[PDB]
């Protein structure tokens, strides 16, 4: 699977470390393009980083800090487009991967494939084992029209570096080896030539091409300046509709495509909103509704009527810079059937800002969210009031799409709680992202949950630690109920089943439906039990009703 997604956790220490590595190994294991900030921080030394080994592109910045590994195998790293940049400057920054007072610490960049740095500068400081980082002609990397050609570099180490490779032309090298040799492609090139494969002219790369080539064509390119149109690094993916130049009726253009980040695709991928105007997003353009389309797609179409009112979460609109839910915003969410944005409950949710006479959130207030079905963002909990034994004010929460993810990576997080079981019964889709569930001392009925069906993509996985030991969990007796199919439940009893063994009577699982004996004869429908019409006489044993409405019964 080519495309993964960045993190966005900066230099901030990983909440659950014992998980953290296994977070990285999931995010990118299989990954080629990385729409956004490749962040590899805090990693200690016993740490096999063999999943990055596939990554070409990186749209974001590339942050490397406070690690300890002597080496990070980012060896195939073609181009880093600095779309967003670290500290709004550096499309790459390697910081303090030295030791917290022979030794550990990052030693060689080995970036022997990094041709282009489309935007932003470079910042490589305080890595007391790092060599040959000055020894790079950084000016060949930066794009031509890179007007962010700024660089700061530390050379101080406690270690004395070795000579480069003999097999290296200049003293220039990424690493001591001979394949680790800086291979230039802008300065050592022929004329106007942005990118080329040798001093010769014929060695020039295409203009649409962008990080060198193996030929004169766009279909010979090492990267793309605008969009990989199915192998032909272009300027513009063919739009969805063409014009007669004269009249101007535009019947659709069959061989048109969709700009996916840096790509040119026919069908915007899973969690992504295909558009009228031809993009893929996770926010529809203004004056658009997010429909649910004549297929299965999400889609972003217009608004005839001034569009109908819509709920917003944290990191969206007036709530954008808000971080937690408090008493002073909790009411906005009443009535909300689908929250655009995200909700998060930090421990300041539950003791308010006395600095601002903001009352602490009371556990009766949460009883707003039972009306909520679909979160388009993340869900993050770290305090939940001591009482409420379960996350069930979201009992009706059906899907979490995670087109925002907490700390970059996590669509559903749960830490330092004290609930005794989950309770999201209705939760079927975990659209994207990883679920992190750690340090809830009393948390059982996690194992009991079949995550593998919530999830939507292979890179996805539930990671968890420091919870309540799932062997001590049948130790007090806790386990799914008999009416919960395939052994799968979200908590005790047949409310928290995942699929009912036989039928549903509302929110409770049952063995069968009163077609024959129960206090009112019912009729079965989508394995739901529903009542017939009260005036359809009770039959002394046999079938009574035959449907919900007034007629289809007896008398």
């Amino acid at each position: 699977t080519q495309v993964c997604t960045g993190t966005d956790m900066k230099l901030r220490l990983p909440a659950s470390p014992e998980t953290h590595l296994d977070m990285l190994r999931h995010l990118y294991q299989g990954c080629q393009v990385v729409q956004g900030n490749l962040e590899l921080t805090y990693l200690p030394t016993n740490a096999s980083l063999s999943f990055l080994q596939d990554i070409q592109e990186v749209q974001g910045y590339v942050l490397i800090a406070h690690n300890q590994v002597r080496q990070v195998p980012l060896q195939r790293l073609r181009i880093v487009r600095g779309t967003q940049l670290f500290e709004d400057n550096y499309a790459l920054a390697v910081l303090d991967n030295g030791d917290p007072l022979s030794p550990g610490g990052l030693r060689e960049l080995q970036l022997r494939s990094l041709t282009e740095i489309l935007k932003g500068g470079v910042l490589i400081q305080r890595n007391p084992q790092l060599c040959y980082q000055d020894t790079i002609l950084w000016k060949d990397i930066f794009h031509k029209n890179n007007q962010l050609a700024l660089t700061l570099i530390d050379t101080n180490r406690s270690r004395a570096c070795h000579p480069c490779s003999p097999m290296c032309k200049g003293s220039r090298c990424w690493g001591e080896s001979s394949e680790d040799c800086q291979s230039l492609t802008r300065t050592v090139c022929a004329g106007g030539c942005a990118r080329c494969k040798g001093p010769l002219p014929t060695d020039c790369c295409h203009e649409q091409c962008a990080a060198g080539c193996t030929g004169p064509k766009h279909s010979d390119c090492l990267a793309c300046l605008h969009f990989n149109h199915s192998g032909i690094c272009e300027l513009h993916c063919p739009a969805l509709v063409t014009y007669n130049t004269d009249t101007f009726e535009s019947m659709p253009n069959p061989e048109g495509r969709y700009t996916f980040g840096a790509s040119c695709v026919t069908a915007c991928p899973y969690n992504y909103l295909s558009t009228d105007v031809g993009s893929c997003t996770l926010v529809c353009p203004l004056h658009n509704q997010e429909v649910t389309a004549e297929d299965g797609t999400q889609r972003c179409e217009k608004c005839s009527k001034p569009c109908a009112r819509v709920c917003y979460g944290l990191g969206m609109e007036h709530l954008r810079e808000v971080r937690a839910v408090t008493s002073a915003n909790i009411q906005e969410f009443a009535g909300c059937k689908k929250i655009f944005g995200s909700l998060a409950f930090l421990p300041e949710s539950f003791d308010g800002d006395p600095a601002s006479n903001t009352a602490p959130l009371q556990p009766e207030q949460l009883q707003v969210f039972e009306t909520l079905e679909e979160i388009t963002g993340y869900l993050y909990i770290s305090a939940w009031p001591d009482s409420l034994p379960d996350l069930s004010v979201f009992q009706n929460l059906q899907v979490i799409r995670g087109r925002i993810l907490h700390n970059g990576a996590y669509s559903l997080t749960l830490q330092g709680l004290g609930i005794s079981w989950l309770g999201l019964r209705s939760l079927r889709e975990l659209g994207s992202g990883l679920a992190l569930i750690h340090h809830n001392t009393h948390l059982c009925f996690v194992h009991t949950v079949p995550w593998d069906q919530l999830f939507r993509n292979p890179h996805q996985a539930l990671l968890h630690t420091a919870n309540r030991p799932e062997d001590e969990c049948v130790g007090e007796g806790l386990a799914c109920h008999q009416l919960c199919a395939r052994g799968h439940c979200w908590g005790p009893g047949p409310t928290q089943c995942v699929n009912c063994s036989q039928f549903l009577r509302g929110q409770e699982c049952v063995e069968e439906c009163r077609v024959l004996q129960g206090l009112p004869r019912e009729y079965v429908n989508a394995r739901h039990c529903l009542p017939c019409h009260p005036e359809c006489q009770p039959q002394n044993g046999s079938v009574t009703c035959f449907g919900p409405e007034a007629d289809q019964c007896v008398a």
């Epitope: 421990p347 300041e348 539950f350 003791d351 006395p354 600095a355 009352a359």
Partner: antibody, heavy 118, light 111 residues
Framework: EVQLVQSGGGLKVPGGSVKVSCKAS????????ISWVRQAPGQGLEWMGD????????NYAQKLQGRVTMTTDTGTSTAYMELRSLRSDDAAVYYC???????????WGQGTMVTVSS | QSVLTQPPSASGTPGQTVTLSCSGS????????VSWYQQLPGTAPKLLTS???QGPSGVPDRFSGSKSGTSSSLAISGLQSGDEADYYC???????????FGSGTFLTVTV
């Protein structure tokens, strides 16, 4: 074990300053506040000010305004009691504390030794 | 917003059921701002009850506070041998909010 550790425990001449340290560990520093409180000998408690870890905002009490600056240090995780224009009155013990929950102050640095006399 | 502790000193022998007070100077929250502390001689004060009737973790069940109108009341089941300390409360309502002049108990081993 979550912790707060305090330093600066010294002596001072009236009309000087001190900036007490408070290195907080073993918990996401940014997602709780941090507060300071003082305790002269024989007497009792008295609250200094607030300090949302996440975003700086403050609430230095009345008896001390303009004489106090409190500062977070996210990068390194420390809170600082920058106290000014002190005197004999201002000789006390300056504890630092968070407020997990659910509302008061739970974890407590040992407090520091601050005495003024010329 | 403010309070007063009576007494600044109550004494106690083992097995006994104790009481300490605090008078909230306004209809505080609401309910649940108040919290009591334990102060060992020459060491850091630590929280005992908060939300009035709720122990934290690492503070024992012979501890349990309460409230009534604008007054709070800490309670000890049977007193023990380590409970030599001064006890403070707080109405953590608005800001700025106040502490108290301190109810401090001691272990009466034959006056």
């Amino acid at each position: 074990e979550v912790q707060l550790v305090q330093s600066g425990g010294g002596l001072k001449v009236p009309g000087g300053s001190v900036k007490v340290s408070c290195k907080a560990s073993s918990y996401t520093f940014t997602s709780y506040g941090i507060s300071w409180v003082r305790q002269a000998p024989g007497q009792g408690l008295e609250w200094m000010g607030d300090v949302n870890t996440y975003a700086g905002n403050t609430n230095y009490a009345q008896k001390l305004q303009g004489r106090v600056t409190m500062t977070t240090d996210t990068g390194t995780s420390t809170a600082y009691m920058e106290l000014r224009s002190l005197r004999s009155d201002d000789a006390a013990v300056y504890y630092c504390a968070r407020d997990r929950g659910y509302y008061a102050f739970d974890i407590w640095g040992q407090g520091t030794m601050v005495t003024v006399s010329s | 917003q403010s309070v007063l502790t009576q007494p600044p000193s109550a004494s106690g022998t083992p097995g006994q059921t104790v009481t300490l007070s605090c008078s909230g100077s306004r209809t505080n929250a609401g309910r649940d701002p108040v919290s009591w502390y334990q102060q060992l001689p020459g060491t850091a004060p630590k929280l005992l009850t908060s939300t009035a009737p709720q122990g934290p973790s690492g503070v024992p069940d012979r501890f349990s506070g309460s409230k009534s109108g604008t007054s709070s009341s800490l309670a000890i089941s049977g007193l023990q041998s380590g409970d030599e300390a001064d006890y403070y409360c707080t109405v953590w309502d608005s800001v700025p909010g106040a502490s108290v002049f301190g109810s401090g108990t001691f272990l009466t081993v034959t006056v």
